[PDB]
Design a protein around this ligand. Structure first.
Ligand SMILES: [Cl-]
Ligand code: NA
Ligand code: NA
Length: 189
């Protein structure tokens, strides 16, 4: 499927060195401005060596910058696209207190956040309600990712931008929630 199909996404990694990956179904899309074919649809099994769909993803901010993919009760950790030895592992073993089958995850510009249903967990290398602490985020999310100064939450075919200083959905025009394809990816009309 094409990146700009307008369909919802399943997971996003965090912006790292100007690039990130989006996931939808069996497909992995590398989002890099330097790409000659930006967002060329590749198979998750071909790029990451695992079957889609995936549940959530994040990338850590440290210099190793390892990427974590979550599916069901398991997670995989990669470095430079290569699966580390002794993965996959159980979420319950790597992330004590985090549930299986998460909806989304993100790593802050060291804190990671997991989202499932109306709740989210803070993990540092006690659930709370998403709408209580992320002002303007409706509750249930389908995917999330962090940039440098903002985080983004995805719901169906639309998304929200949250300012990290205020923890509030920013006021833009047209307002959030708005089309992922049109306003986040800049897809052609
Ligand atoms: Cl995600
Ligand atoms: Na994510
Ligand atoms: Na998801």
């Amino acid at each position: 499927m094409e990146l700009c199909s307008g369909k919802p996404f399943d997971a996003f990694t965090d912006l790292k060195n100007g690039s990130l990956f989006a996931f939808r179904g069996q497909y992995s899309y590398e989002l890099d401005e330097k790409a000659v074919r930006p967002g060329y649809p590749k198979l998750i099994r071909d790029v990451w060596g695992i079957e889609g769909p995936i549940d959530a993803a994040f990338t850590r901010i440290n210099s190793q910058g390892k990427t974590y993919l979550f599916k069901g009760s398991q997670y995989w950790r990669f470095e430079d696209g290569v699966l580390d030895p002794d993965y996959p592992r159980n979420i319950s073993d790597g992330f004590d207190g985090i549930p299986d089958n998460v909806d989304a995850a993100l790593a802050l510009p060291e804190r990671v956040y997991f989202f499932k249903g109306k709740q989210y967990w803070e993990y540092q290398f006690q659930p709370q309600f998403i709408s209580r602490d992320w002002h303007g985020v409706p509750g249930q999310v389908d995917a999330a990712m962090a940039g440098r100064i903002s985080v983004f939450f995805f719901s169906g075919d639309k998304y929200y931008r949250v300012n990290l200083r205020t923890r509030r959905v920013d006021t833009v025009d047209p307002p959030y929630p708005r089309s992922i394809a049109q306003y986040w990816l800049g897809c052609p009309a």
